[PDB]
């Protein structure tokens, strides 16, 4: 009985929102509200895009806009998995869905990477923002050693195809194109099935 | 697989409808963009090219965020046909693989308009309430499957339309999964 209508309605609303060509602050404010409404419910994500991998965290594209104005991704960390330290180069929202993860912000200093504040500790329903304007560099990791964690991320592009960077401790940058773990997206558009 | 072709078609079709042009302009520029896609048979994933023994298959490839358009791979097995149906929105039919025919109809009951249009790879046809909406599309080969790529001014699988002897018609989709056409680094 997957409530795929929730993801369909999120995608529609996010489309309508960007049709008004609003500023980043308005996108993040209205966006985090719409994402909050989606990730408050754990009755809609298909099992195929909730699956951990033993070697690396999984990046399942759920929807990309026709003009690549936004994308929606299911990120799945297994026990003890982390992202590299990375930037985005576009606005991003992180909606916590299942389990426990932490997000550490970083800044580029004289020495290299320095963490800003404590890790932000996410639990289901919580939404965080990233952007070049408000803070773009972070590392997201599973805070459980025996359970997988899932967050739904929304970006101001097709994030899997954005040329961005990972950072080493000394602040040196490697090119980063994340791509996607899935060859298949979920069909959220067969409304007659419901 | 040259999935970049489908990605570029979807982008261009989005840009086109951003200009909020009239149906005539959509069909004119659209059939040109679709013609460019279906002239090449190096991009369709095999999972959305598969015939079914019992009924023709309707694989959604892409739906717009606001359901302004959709792109569908239709697959007829040897000797399969659609019912006689309308669309209630503009539609483009791009022939990709094999041989099919399209018979137009008018309400008189049903009378066929002209001969069946005989499609071969690269050919693009249009339907719309304005220009003629009622047709039947069928495989013209008795041993080979046929594939055409269709583009509609809605999420066609969810449009309330009709089949004609009117019965209500909502076509839906054969696939639970769409292709990921957005992983550009794979190329
Ligand atoms: Cl992120
Ligand atoms: Cl059609
Ligand atoms: Fe991130
Ligand atoms: Fe048709
Ligand atoms: Mg918290």
With beta carbons less than 8 A apart as the criterion, state whether A67 and B11 touch.
yes
Report the C-alpha gap between A173 and A146 in whole angstroms.
32
A171 domain residue, yes or no: yes
B187 domain residue, yes or no: no
B73 and B30 inside one domain: no
A72 domain residue, yes or no: yes
B73 domain residue, yes or no: yes
B75 and B34 inside one domain: no
Sheet bearing A127-130, strands edge to edge: A58-64, A71-77, A149-155, A92-98, A127-130
Q: Is B160 on the interface with A (CB under 8 A)?
A: no
| Residue A164 is assigned to a ligand binding site | no
A21 and A114 inside one domain: no
What DSSP line would sit under A174-192, residue for residue?
A: EEE----S-SEEE----GG
Report the C-alpha gap between A152 and A101 in whole angstroms.
12
A173 domain residue, yes or no: yes
Report the C-alpha gap between B184 and A182 in whole angstroms.
13
B18 and B89 inside one domain: no
Report the C-alpha gap between B167 and A191 in whole angstroms.
19
A105 domain residue, yes or no: yes
CB contact under 8 Å between B176 and A187, yes or no, is yes
B113 and B160 inside one domain: yes
Q: Is A191 on the interface with B (CB under 8 A)?
A: yes
A104 and A53 inside one domain: yes
B108 and B171 inside one domain: yes
CB contact under 8 Å between A183 and B178, yes or no, is no
A115 and A76 inside one domain: yes
A189 domain residue, yes or no: no
A91 domain residue, yes or no: yes
B158 DSSP β-pair partners? none
Report the C-alpha gap between A48 and B177 in whole angstroms.
10
Report the C-alpha gap between B7 and B44 in whole angstroms.
11
Q: Resolution limit in angstroms?
A: 2.2
Q: Rounded to whole angstroms, what are the CA distances from A125 to A19, A121, A136, B75, B149?
A: 26, 12, 21, 42, 40
Q: Which two tokens stand for residue A144?
A: 């459980």
Q: Is A22 on the interface with B (CB under 8 A)?
A: no
A37 and A50 inside one domain: no
With beta carbons less than 8 A apart as the criterion, state whether A192 and B172 touch.
yes
A93 and A134 inside one domain: yes
CB contacts of B168 in chain A (<8 Å) are: none
A72 and A157 inside one domain: yes
Tally of domains in chain B: 2
Q: Residue A133: which domain range?
A: 43-184
A140 and A80 inside one domain: yes
């Amino acid at each position: 009985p997957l409530r795929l209508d929730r993801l369909r309605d999120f995608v529609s609303a996010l489309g309508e929102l960007l049709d008004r060509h609003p500023d980043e602050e308005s996108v993040l404010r209205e966006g985090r509200s719409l994402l909050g409404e989606l990730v408050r419910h754990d009755d809609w994500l298909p099992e195929e895009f909730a699956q951990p991998d033993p070697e690396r965290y999984q990046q399942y594209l759920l929807h990309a806009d026709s003009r690549q104005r936004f994308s929606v991704v299911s990120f799945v960390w297994g026990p003890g998995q982390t992202t590299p330290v990375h930037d985005h180069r576009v606005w991003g929202l992180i909606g916590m869905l299942r389990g426990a993860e932490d997000a550490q912000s970083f800044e580029l200093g004289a020495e290299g990477l320095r963490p800003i504040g404590d890790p932000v500790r996410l639990s289901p329903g919580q939404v965080e923002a990233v952007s070049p304007r408000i803070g773009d560099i972070h590392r997201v990791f599973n805070a459980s050693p025996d359970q997988p964690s899932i967050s739904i991320h929304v970006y101001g592009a097709n994030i899997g195809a954005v040329r961005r960077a990972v950072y080493l401790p000394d602040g040196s940058e490697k090119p980063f194109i994340s791509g996607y773990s899935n060859q298949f997206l979920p069909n959220i558009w067969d409304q007659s099935k419901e």
